Coordinates of C-alpha atoms and ligand atoms in Angstrom, one line a residue:
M2 CA -21.4 -38.5 -10.6
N3 CA -21.8 -34.7 -11.0
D4 CA -24.6 -35.5 -13.5
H5 CA -27.5 -33.1 -13.4
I6 CA -25.4 -31.2 -10.8
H7 CA -25.1 -27.4 -11.6
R8 CA -22.3 -25.4 -9.9
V9 CA -23.4 -21.8 -9.1
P10 CA -21.7 -19.8 -10.5
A11 CA -20.8 -22.3 -13.2
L12 CA -17.4 -20.5 -13.5
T13 CA -14.2 -22.4 -12.7
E14 CA -12.1 -21.4 -9.7
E15 CA -9.7 -19.7 -12.0
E16 CA -12.4 -17.6 -13.7
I17 CA -14.0 -16.7 -10.3
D18 CA -10.6 -15.4 -9.1
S19 CA -10.1 -13.4 -12.3
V20 CA -13.6 -11.8 -12.2
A21 CA -13.2 -11.1 -8.5
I22 CA -9.9 -9.2 -9.1
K23 CA -11.3 -7.0 -11.8
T24 CA -14.4 -6.3 -9.7
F25 CA -12.3 -5.3 -6.7
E26 CA -10.2 -3.1 -8.9
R27 CA -13.2 -1.6 -10.7
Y28 CA -14.5 -0.5 -7.3
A29 CA -11.2 0.0 -5.4
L30 CA -10.8 3.3 -3.6
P31 CA -8.2 5.4 -5.5
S32 CA -4.8 5.7 -3.8
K33 CA -6.0 10.2 3.8
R34 CA -6.1 7.6 6.6
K35 CA -6.3 9.4 9.9
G36 CA -7.5 7.3 12.9
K37 CA -5.4 5.9 15.7
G38 CA -4.9 2.8 17.8
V39 CA -6.3 -0.7 17.4
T40 CA -9.8 -1.6 16.3
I41 CA -11.6 -5.0 16.1
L42 CA -13.7 -5.8 13.1
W43 CA -16.4 -8.4 14.1
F44 CA -18.0 -9.9 11.1
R45 CA -21.2 -11.9 11.6
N46 CA -23.2 -12.2 8.3
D47 CA -21.3 -9.4 6.2
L48 CA -18.6 -11.7 5.0
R49 CA -17.2 -9.5 2.2
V50 CA -14.8 -6.7 1.7
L51 CA -16.4 -4.6 -1.0
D52 CA -19.3 -2.3 -0.2
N53 CA -18.6 -2.8 3.6
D54 CA -19.2 0.2 5.8
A55 CA -18.2 -1.4 9.1
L56 CA -14.8 -2.4 7.4
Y57 CA -14.3 1.2 6.1
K58 CA -15.3 2.9 9.4
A59 CA -12.9 0.5 11.2
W60 CA -10.0 1.2 8.8
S61 CA -10.8 4.9 8.8
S62 CA -10.6 5.4 12.5
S63 CA -7.6 3.3 13.3
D64 CA -3.8 2.5 12.7
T65 CA -4.2 -1.3 12.8
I66 CA -7.2 -3.7 12.3
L67 CA -7.9 -7.1 13.9
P68 CA -10.7 -8.7 11.8
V69 CA -12.5 -11.4 13.7
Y70 CA -15.1 -14.1 13.2
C71 CA -16.6 -16.1 16.1
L72 CA -18.1 -19.5 15.4
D73 CA -21.0 -19.2 17.8
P74 CA -21.9 -22.6 19.4
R75 CA -25.6 -21.5 19.5
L76 CA -25.6 -21.4 15.6
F77 CA -25.3 -25.3 15.8
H78 CA -27.8 -26.1 18.5
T79 CA -31.5 -26.5 17.4
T80 CA -34.3 -24.5 16.1
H81 CA -36.7 -22.7 18.5
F82 CA -40.0 -24.5 18.7
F83 CA -39.6 -27.8 17.0
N84 CA -35.9 -28.4 17.5
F85 CA -34.6 -29.1 14.0
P86 CA -30.9 -28.4 13.7
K87 CA -30.3 -24.6 14.0
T88 CA -28.0 -24.8 10.8
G89 CA -28.3 -27.6 8.4
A90 CA -25.2 -29.3 6.9
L91 CA -25.5 -27.7 3.6
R92 CA -25.6 -24.1 4.9
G93 CA -22.9 -24.9 7.3
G94 CA -20.7 -26.0 4.4
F95 CA -21.5 -22.9 2.5
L96 CA -20.5 -20.9 5.6
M97 CA -17.1 -22.5 6.0
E98 CA -16.5 -21.8 2.3
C99 CA -17.5 -18.1 2.9
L100 CA -15.0 -17.8 5.7
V101 CA -12.2 -19.3 3.6
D102 CA -12.8 -16.9 0.8
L103 CA -13.2 -13.9 3.2
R104 CA -9.8 -14.8 4.9
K105 CA -8.3 -15.0 1.4
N106 CA -9.6 -11.6 0.3
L107 CA -8.6 -10.0 3.5
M108 CA -5.1 -11.3 3.3
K109 CA -5.0 -9.7 -0.3
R110 CA -5.4 -6.3 1.3
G111 CA -2.8 -6.8 4.0
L112 CA -5.2 -8.1 6.6
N113 CA -6.2 -11.6 7.9
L114 CA -9.0 -13.2 9.7
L115 CA -9.0 -14.5 13.3
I116 CA -11.2 -17.5 13.7
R117 CA -12.4 -18.3 17.2
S118 CA -14.9 -20.8 18.5
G119 CA -17.1 -19.5 21.2
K120 CA -19.7 -16.8 22.1
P121 CA -18.9 -13.2 20.9
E122 CA -19.7 -11.8 24.3
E123 CA -16.9 -13.9 25.7
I124 CA -14.4 -13.6 22.9
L125 CA -14.6 -10.0 21.8
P126 CA -14.1 -8.5 25.3
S127 CA -11.1 -10.6 25.9
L128 CA -9.5 -9.6 22.5
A129 CA -10.3 -6.0 23.0
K130 CA -8.4 -6.0 26.3
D131 CA -5.5 -8.1 25.0
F132 CA -4.9 -5.7 22.0
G133 CA -6.0 -2.6 23.7
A134 CA -8.8 -2.0 21.1
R135 CA -10.4 1.3 21.1
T136 CA -13.5 0.0 19.3
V137 CA -15.3 -3.0 18.0
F138 CA -17.0 -2.4 14.7
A139 CA -19.8 -4.6 13.1
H140 CA -23.1 -4.4 11.4
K141 CA -26.3 -3.8 13.3
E142 CA -28.8 -6.8 13.2
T143 CA -32.6 -6.6 13.7
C144 CA -34.1 -9.9 15.1
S145 CA -34.1 -10.6 18.9
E146 CA -31.5 -13.4 18.9
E147 CA -28.9 -11.2 17.2
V148 CA -29.8 -8.1 19.1
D149 CA -29.4 -10.0 22.4
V150 CA -25.9 -10.9 21.4
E151 CA -25.2 -7.2 20.7
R152 CA -26.4 -6.4 24.2
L153 CA -24.3 -9.1 25.8
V154 CA -21.2 -8.0 23.8
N155 CA -21.9 -4.4 24.8
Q156 CA -22.3 -5.2 28.4
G157 CA -19.2 -7.5 28.2
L158 CA -17.1 -4.7 27.0
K159 CA -18.2 -2.4 29.8
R160 CA -17.6 -5.0 32.3
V161 CA -14.0 -5.1 31.3
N162 CA -14.8 0.0 29.8
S163 CA -12.3 1.5 27.4
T164 CA -13.7 -0.2 24.2
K165 CA -16.9 1.0 22.5
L166 CA -19.1 -1.2 20.3
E167 CA -19.9 0.6 17.1
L168 CA -22.8 -0.9 15.2
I169 CA -23.1 0.3 11.7
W170 CA -26.4 -0.1 9.8
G171 CA -25.8 -1.5 6.3
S172 CA -27.6 -4.6 4.8
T173 CA -30.4 -2.9 2.7
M174 CA -30.7 -1.2 -0.6
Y175 CA -32.2 1.8 1.1
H176 CA -30.6 3.0 4.2
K177 CA -32.7 3.1 7.4
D178 CA -31.8 6.7 8.0
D179 CA -33.0 7.8 4.6
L180 CA -36.5 6.3 4.7
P181 CA -39.5 8.6 4.4
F182 CA -40.8 7.5 7.7
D183 CA -39.6 6.1 11.0
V184 CA -39.5 2.3 11.0
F185 CA -42.3 2.2 13.6
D186 CA -44.5 3.6 10.9
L187 CA -43.5 1.3 8.1
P188 CA -46.5 0.8 5.8
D189 CA -48.1 -2.6 6.4
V190 CA -48.8 -3.0 2.7
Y191 CA -45.7 -3.7 0.6
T192 CA -47.1 -1.7 -2.4
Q193 CA -47.3 1.4 -0.2
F194 CA -43.6 1.0 1.0
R195 CA -42.4 0.3 -2.4
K196 CA -43.9 3.3 -4.1
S197 CA -43.0 5.5 -1.3
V198 CA -39.2 4.6 -1.2
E199 CA -38.9 4.5 -5.0
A200 CA -40.1 8.2 -5.2
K201 CA -38.6 9.7 -2.0
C202 CA -35.4 7.9 -1.1
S203 CA -32.5 7.4 -3.6
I204 CA -29.9 4.7 -3.0
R205 CA -26.4 5.5 -1.6
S206 CA -23.4 4.8 -3.7
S207 CA -21.3 1.8 -2.7
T208 CA -18.5 2.5 -0.2
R209 CA -15.2 2.2 -1.9
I210 CA -12.5 0.3 -0.2
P211 CA -8.7 0.8 -0.4
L212 CA -6.6 -2.1 -2.0
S213 CA -4.2 -1.8 0.9
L214 CA -5.9 -1.8 4.4
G215 CA -2.9 -1.1 6.7
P216 CA -1.6 -3.7 9.2
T217 CA -3.1 -6.0 11.6
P218 CA -1.8 -6.5 15.2
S219 CA 0.8 -9.1 15.9
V220 CA -1.3 -12.1 16.7
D221 CA 0.5 -15.5 17.2
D222 CA -2.4 -17.7 16.1
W223 CA -5.0 -16.7 13.6
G224 CA -6.8 -20.0 14.0
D225 CA -8.4 -21.8 11.1
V226 CA -11.7 -22.7 9.5
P227 CA -13.0 -25.9 11.1
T228 CA -14.0 -29.1 9.3
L229 CA -17.7 -29.4 10.4
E230 CA -17.5 -32.6 12.2
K231 CA -15.5 -30.6 14.7
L232 CA -18.7 -28.5 15.0
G233 CA -21.0 -31.5 15.4
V234 CA -22.2 -31.4 11.9
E235 CA -21.8 -34.1 9.2
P236 CA -20.8 -32.9 5.8
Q237 CA -23.5 -33.4 3.1
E238 CA -23.0 -33.8 -0.7
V239 CA -25.3 -32.1 -3.3
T240 CA -26.2 -35.0 -5.6
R241 CA -28.4 -33.2 -8.1
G242 CA -29.5 -29.7 -8.8
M243 CA -27.5 -26.5 -7.9
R244 CA -24.6 -26.7 -5.5
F245 CA -23.7 -23.1 -4.9
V246 CA -20.2 -22.0 -4.0
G247 CA -19.6 -19.9 -0.9
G248 CA -17.7 -16.6 -0.7
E249 CA -17.7 -13.1 -2.0
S250 CA -15.5 -14.1 -4.9
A251 CA -18.1 -16.7 -6.0
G252 CA -20.9 -14.2 -5.3
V253 CA -19.3 -11.4 -7.3
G254 CA -18.8 -14.1 -9.9
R255 CA -22.5 -15.0 -10.1
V256 CA -23.5 -11.4 -10.6
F257 CA -21.0 -11.3 -13.5
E258 CA -22.3 -14.6 -14.9
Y259 CA -26.0 -13.8 -14.6
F260 CA -25.8 -10.1 -15.9
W261 CA -22.8 -9.9 -18.3
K262 CA -21.7 -13.4 -19.3
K263 CA -25.2 -14.8 -19.9
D264 CA -26.9 -11.4 -20.5
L265 CA -30.0 -12.8 -18.8
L266 CA -30.9 -9.6 -16.8
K267 CA -32.9 -8.4 -19.8
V268 CA -35.3 -11.2 -19.5
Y269 CA -35.4 -11.9 -15.7
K270 CA -39.0 -10.7 -15.3
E271 CA -40.3 -13.2 -17.8
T272 CA -38.6 -16.2 -16.2
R273 CA -38.6 -15.3 -12.4
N274 CA -41.4 -17.8 -11.8
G275 CA -39.5 -20.8 -13.2
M276 CA -38.6 -23.6 -10.9
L277 CA -35.9 -25.7 -12.8
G278 CA -32.3 -24.6 -13.3
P279 CA -30.0 -21.8 -12.4
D280 CA -31.1 -19.5 -15.4
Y281 CA -34.6 -18.7 -14.5
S282 CA -33.5 -16.3 -11.9
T283 CA -30.6 -14.4 -10.3
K284 CA -29.7 -17.1 -7.5
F285 CA -28.1 -14.2 -5.5
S286 CA -30.0 -15.0 -2.3
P287 CA -27.5 -17.2 -0.5
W288 CA -24.6 -14.7 -1.0
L289 CA -27.0 -11.9 0.0
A290 CA -27.9 -13.8 3.3
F291 CA -24.3 -14.1 4.4
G292 CA -23.6 -10.6 3.1
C293 CA -21.0 -11.9 0.6
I294 CA -22.4 -9.2 -1.8
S295 CA -24.5 -6.2 -1.1
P296 CA -27.7 -4.8 -2.7
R297 CA -26.0 -1.5 -3.3
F298 CA -23.3 -3.3 -5.3
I299 CA -26.0 -5.2 -7.3
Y300 CA -27.8 -1.9 -8.0
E301 CA -24.6 -0.3 -9.4
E302 CA -24.1 -3.3 -11.7
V303 CA -27.8 -3.1 -12.7
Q304 CA -27.2 0.7 -13.6
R305 CA -24.0 -0.1 -15.5
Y306 CA -25.9 -2.8 -17.4
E307 CA -28.7 -0.5 -18.2
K308 CA -26.2 2.0 -19.5
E309 CA -24.1 -0.4 -21.5
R310 CA -26.6 -3.1 -22.6
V311 CA -30.3 -2.3 -22.2
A312 CA -33.0 -1.1 -19.7
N313 CA -36.5 -2.5 -19.5
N314 CA -39.0 -4.0 -17.0
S315 CA -36.7 -7.0 -16.4
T316 CA -33.6 -5.0 -15.5
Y317 CA -35.8 -3.1 -13.1
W318 CA -37.6 -6.1 -11.7
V319 CA -34.5 -7.4 -10.1
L320 CA -34.4 -4.1 -8.0
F321 CA -38.2 -4.5 -7.3
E322 CA -37.4 -7.8 -5.9
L323 CA -34.5 -6.4 -3.8
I324 CA -37.0 -4.0 -2.3
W325 CA -39.0 -7.0 -1.0
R326 CA -35.8 -8.0 0.9
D327 CA -35.4 -4.4 2.3
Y328 CA -39.1 -4.4 3.3
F329 CA -38.8 -7.6 5.4
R330 CA -35.7 -6.3 7.1
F331 CA -37.5 -3.1 8.2
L332 CA -40.7 -5.2 8.9
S333 CA -38.6 -7.3 11.4
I334 CA -38.0 -4.2 13.3
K335 CA -41.6 -3.0 13.4
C336 CA -42.9 -6.4 14.3
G337 CA -40.3 -7.7 16.7
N338 CA -41.0 -11.3 17.9
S339 CA -44.6 -11.2 16.6
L340 CA -42.9 -12.2 13.3
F341 CA -42.2 -15.6 15.0
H342 CA -45.4 -16.2 17.0
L343 CA -48.1 -18.5 15.8
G344 CA -50.5 -15.7 15.6
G345 CA -48.1 -13.7 13.7
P346 CA -47.8 -9.9 13.5
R347 CA -51.7 -9.7 13.3
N348 CA -51.9 -12.1 16.3
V349 CA -54.6 -14.2 14.6
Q350 CA -56.4 -16.6 17.0
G351 CA -57.0 -20.3 16.2
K352 CA -55.6 -23.8 16.5
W353 CA -53.2 -25.6 14.3
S354 CA -52.1 -29.2 14.1
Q355 CA -48.5 -30.3 14.8
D356 CA -49.2 -33.8 13.5
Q357 CA -45.7 -35.3 13.4
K358 CA -46.7 -37.9 10.7
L359 CA -48.1 -35.3 8.3
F360 CA -45.2 -32.9 8.7
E361 CA -42.8 -35.7 8.1
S362 CA -44.3 -36.6 4.7
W363 CA -44.1 -32.9 3.7
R364 CA -40.5 -32.7 4.8
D365 CA -39.6 -36.0 3.3
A366 CA -41.2 -35.2 -0.1
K367 CA -43.7 -38.0 0.3
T368 CA -47.1 -36.2 0.1
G369 CA -48.2 -37.9 -3.1
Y370 CA -48.3 -34.5 -4.9
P371 CA -45.5 -34.2 -7.4
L372 CA -45.4 -30.3 -7.4
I373 CA -45.1 -30.4 -3.6
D374 CA -42.6 -33.3 -3.3
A375 CA -40.3 -32.0 -6.1
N376 CA -39.8 -28.8 -4.3
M377 CA -39.3 -30.3 -0.8
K378 CA -36.7 -32.7 -2.4
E379 CA -34.9 -29.9 -4.1
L380 CA -34.8 -28.1 -0.7
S381 CA -33.2 -31.0 1.3
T382 CA -30.9 -31.9 -1.5
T383 CA -29.6 -28.4 -2.5
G384 CA -30.7 -26.0 0.3
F385 CA -32.6 -23.8 -2.2
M386 CA -36.1 -23.7 -3.7
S387 CA -37.6 -21.3 -6.3
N388 CA -39.7 -18.4 -4.9
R389 CA -42.7 -19.9 -6.8
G390 CA -42.2 -23.3 -5.1
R391 CA -41.7 -21.8 -1.6
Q392 CA -45.1 -20.0 -2.0
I393 CA -46.7 -23.3 -3.1
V394 CA -45.3 -25.6 -0.3
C395 CA -46.2 -22.9 2.3
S396 CA -49.8 -22.8 1.1
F397 CA -49.9 -26.6 1.0
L398 CA -48.6 -27.1 4.5
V399 CA -50.9 -24.4 5.9
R400 CA -54.1 -24.8 3.9
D401 CA -54.1 -28.4 2.7
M402 CA -52.3 -30.1 5.7
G403 CA -53.5 -27.5 8.3
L404 CA -50.2 -27.7 10.1
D405 CA -48.6 -25.0 12.4
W406 CA -46.9 -22.8 9.9
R407 CA -43.9 -22.5 12.1
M408 CA -43.0 -26.1 11.5
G409 CA -42.6 -25.2 7.9
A410 CA -40.6 -22.1 8.7
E411 CA -38.2 -23.7 11.0
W412 CA -37.5 -26.5 8.5
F413 CA -36.8 -23.8 6.0
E414 CA -34.6 -22.3 8.6
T415 CA -32.7 -25.5 8.8
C416 CA -32.3 -26.2 5.1
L417 CA -32.0 -22.9 3.2
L418 CA -28.6 -21.6 2.3
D419 CA -30.1 -18.1 1.9
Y420 CA -31.9 -18.4 5.2
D421 CA -32.7 -15.0 6.7
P422 CA -35.0 -14.6 9.7
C423 CA -36.6 -11.4 8.2
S424 CA -37.2 -12.8 4.8
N425 CA -38.1 -16.4 6.0
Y426 CA -40.6 -15.6 8.7
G427 CA -41.7 -12.5 6.9
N428 CA -42.8 -14.5 3.8
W429 CA -44.2 -17.4 5.8
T430 CA -46.2 -14.8 7.7
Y431 CA -47.6 -13.6 4.4
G432 CA -48.3 -17.1 3.0
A433 CA -49.9 -18.3 6.2
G434 CA -52.1 -15.2 6.2
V435 CA -51.1 -14.2 9.7
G436 CA -49.5 -10.9 8.7
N437 CA -51.0 -7.3 8.1
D438 CA -50.8 -7.6 4.3
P439 CA -53.3 -10.0 2.6
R440 CA -51.3 -10.1 -0.6
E441 CA -50.3 -13.8 -0.2
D442 CA -53.1 -14.8 2.1
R443 CA -55.1 -16.9 -0.5
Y444 CA -54.7 -20.4 -1.8
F445 CA -52.5 -22.0 -4.3
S446 CA -54.2 -24.6 -6.4
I447 CA -51.6 -27.4 -6.9
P448 CA -53.2 -28.5 -10.2
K449 CA -53.3 -25.0 -11.5
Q450 CA -49.9 -24.1 -10.2
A451 CA -48.4 -27.2 -11.7
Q452 CA -49.9 -26.5 -15.1
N453 CA -49.0 -22.8 -15.4
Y454 CA -45.5 -23.1 -14.0
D455 CA -44.5 -26.6 -15.1
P456 CA -46.7 -27.4 -18.2
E457 CA -44.3 -30.2 -19.5
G458 CA -43.8 -31.4 -16.0
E459 CA -40.1 -31.3 -16.6
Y460 CA -39.5 -29.7 -13.2
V461 CA -41.3 -32.5 -11.3
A462 CA -39.7 -35.0 -13.5
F463 CA -36.2 -33.7 -12.9
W464 CA -36.7 -34.3 -9.2
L465 CA -39.0 -37.3 -9.0
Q466 CA -37.6 -40.3 -10.8
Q467 CA -40.9 -42.2 -10.7
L468 CA -42.2 -39.6 -13.2
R469 CA -39.3 -39.5 -15.6
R470 CA -40.8 -41.8 -18.2
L471 CA -44.4 -40.6 -17.9
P472 CA -46.2 -38.3 -20.4
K473 CA -46.8 -34.6 -19.8
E474 CA -50.3 -35.1 -18.3
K475 CA -49.4 -38.0 -16.2
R476 CA -46.6 -36.0 -14.5
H477 CA -49.2 -33.6 -13.3
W478 CA -51.5 -36.2 -12.0
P479 CA -49.9 -39.7 -12.2
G480 CA -52.4 -41.4 -9.9
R481 CA -51.6 -43.1 -6.6
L482 CA -50.5 -46.3 -8.2
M483 CA -48.0 -44.7 -10.6
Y484 CA -46.5 -42.5 -7.8
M485 CA -47.8 -43.0 -4.2
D486 CA -50.8 -42.3 -2.0
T487 CA -51.7 -38.7 -1.2
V488 CA -51.2 -38.0 2.5
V489 CA -54.1 -35.5 2.4
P490 CA -56.9 -34.3 0.1
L491 CA -56.6 -30.9 -1.5
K492 CA -58.3 -27.6 -0.5
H493 CA -58.8 -25.7 2.9
Ligands
FAD15 C1 -42.5 -19.0 2.5 C2 -41.2 -18.3 2.0 C3 -40.1 -18.2 2.8 C4 -38.9 -17.6 2.4 N1 -37.8 -17.5 3.3 C5 -36.6 -16.9 2.8 C6 -35.4 -16.8 3.6 O1 -35.3 -17.3 4.8 N2 -34.3 -16.3 3.0 C7 -34.3 -15.7 1.7 O2 -33.2 -15.1 1.3 N3 -35.3 -15.8 1.0 C8 -36.5 -16.4 1.5 N4 -37.5 -16.5 0.7 C9 -37.1 -16.1 -0.6 C10 -37.6 -15.8 -2.1 O3 -38.4 -16.9 -2.5 C11 -36.1 -15.8 -2.5 O4 -35.5 -14.6 -1.9 C12 -35.6 -15.6 -3.9 O5 -36.2 -16.8 -4.6 C13 -34.1 -15.7 -3.8 O6 -33.2 -15.8 -4.9 P1 -33.5 -15.8 -6.4 O7 -32.3 -15.8 -7.1 O8 -34.4 -17.0 -6.6 O9 -34.4 -14.5 -6.7 P2 -34.5 -13.4 -7.9 O10 -33.5 -14.2 -8.6 O11 -35.9 -13.6 -7.6 O12 -33.7 -12.4 -7.0 C14 -34.3 -11.5 -6.2 C15 -33.6 -11.1 -5.0 O13 -34.4 -10.3 -4.2 C16 -34.6 -10.8 -2.8 N5 -36.1 -11.4 -2.9 C17 -36.8 -11.9 -3.9 N6 -38.0 -12.3 -3.5 C18 -38.1 -12.0 -2.2 C19 -39.1 -12.1 -1.2 N7 -40.3 -12.6 -1.5 N8 -38.8 -11.8 0.1 C20 -37.6 -11.2 0.4 N9 -36.5 -11.1 -0.5 C21 -36.8 -11.4 -1.8 C22 -33.5 -11.9 -2.7 O14 -32.5 -11.4 -1.9 C23 -33.2 -12.3 -4.0 O15 -31.9 -12.9 -4.2 C24 -38.8 -17.1 1.1 C25 -39.9 -17.2 0.2 C26 -41.1 -17.8 0.7 C27 -42.4 -17.8 -0.4
MHF16 N1 -31.5 -15.4 12.7 C1 -32.4 -15.6 13.7 N2 -32.7 -14.7 14.7 C2 -33.7 -14.9 15.6 O1 -33.9 -14.1 16.5 C3 -34.6 -16.1 15.5 C4 -34.3 -17.1 14.3 N3 -33.3 -16.7 13.6 N4 -35.1 -18.2 14.3 C5 -36.5 -18.3 15.0 C6 -36.1 -17.8 16.5 C7 -37.4 -17.7 17.3 N5 -37.7 -16.3 17.4 C8 -38.3 -15.8 18.7 C9 -39.6 -16.4 19.0 C10 -40.3 -16.1 20.1 C11 -39.7 -15.1 21.0 C12 -40.5 -14.7 22.2 O2 -41.6 -15.2 22.4 N6 -40.1 -13.8 23.2 C13 -40.9 -13.4 24.2 C14 -40.2 -13.5 25.6 C15 -39.8 -15.0 25.8 C16 -39.1 -15.2 27.1 O3 -38.9 -14.2 27.9 O4 -38.5 -16.3 27.5 C17 -41.5 -12.1 24.0 O5 -42.5 -11.6 24.8 O6 -41.1 -11.4 23.0 C18 -38.4 -14.6 20.8 C19 -37.7 -14.9 19.6 C20 -36.3 -15.7 17.4 N7 -35.6 -16.3 16.4

């Protein structure tokens, strides 16, 4: 049944393990450790061992480490404004896989992974007291929901006050402390930010981790990774398109696959606007979202590729694209919750429709427009959508359907494996024209976009069976009778 189903990476479990081992070794910290006492390493979206500063700082300042992951109940409630599931089944499955792999990789280094179900502010203070932990390490987050959790955990520790919460920044290519400006003065135009950081910042080298990470505390029950039904979520199968394999191993496997095995890095720029297949682009996003791989690691591999293979505009463009990710992270700090408001960071006034019927046709891939439906179907079936497609469906929902852009944003939040509040709401803000950079505040012509990015209509055909046997031109505009009625006319 795995017909037209593409495993990402395509590598077999065996190949992934092999590639992962040699990657770990290539970056291993040569055979020192001072520190003292016990320390708790709280994960949350940085599910990897490699370039992990929180892990290093933890090991560097202790005798024994207790790595922990809390399955936050809130993660499986509903979305903010329109109440879609907080985490869709596909991303949930990806997460479980990430935890399985993280535990495996941690055990390889003499550690393990304590899995607990509950709120971090309740679990961590308890564990800190039970093991007499001196500190709790973890990465610093930026959006309000995550920052609020940090506050609660911090106050929880004090409420019990011999354990300090140590939040380490580390999720971007360029470090926050190395920027040419304070985040409050982040340029509102990406171009200004990009040029500025490229010329005045320099990227830090990846943090090398020892192959042996000392012992863990005693612990009589490390728990286990839940099924999903146990979490109130019903497993979902990818029936066509890309599946995506969770975990750092698979992630490092994809970098290897895209750069070295397939040698596609040198042509990335000329294919990045594709919409069909795993080859047109990196496909790193889901692993970057859960922190299974880091941008600094990617940068090092790009440099090694430019040193051993070739260097051109394509090898560079992957970095250019990672600066977009960095930009939205910093933007989330400067914008705060205005990133989530209807008026956006520019607080634009006006009214938008929340027409349930219209939104449902968009979400259900039944708008009558092949280019639109194909993308929406890919999204709900695989949890991924090309950048080109995301831009298009955003323009369509906002401009053509005139719907509250947040309805589209939250649906993306439910479905995307690579969902990230900064990137998601950041880009939606751009496309919906409610941000402070007019770059994407225009209009995407479905007919033009379809012709330029899917001339043979093979993308739309791959997803919409009704168009499989139709000629090139019919795939672009099949007509209501050969496809279905259009839920709304085109144009503002
Ligand atoms: C309306 C809209 C909403 C989006 N919401 C999210 C989201 O919640 N999470 C998410 O990870 N991506 C989001 N994107 C992502 C962008 O389209 C994807 O980051 C890129 O397609 C992801 O992987 P790739 O392999 O296709 O990219 P390439 O293969 O294009 O890889 C470039 C890498 O750089 C980063 N990147 C590329 N483009 C962007 C961008 N425009 N903004 C931020 N980072 C970028 C990613 O980490 C990506 O893996 C959104 C795009 C739009 C238009
Ligand atoms: N990963 C992630 N982190 C988040 O913080 C987050 C998401 N995802 N998904 C979308 C929701 C919604 N976002 C929001 C939206 C609005 C406010 C807000 O209006 N706050 C008010 C005060 C509200 C109150 O006091 O009840 C404010 O003035 O800022 C906050 C967070 C945060 N969200």
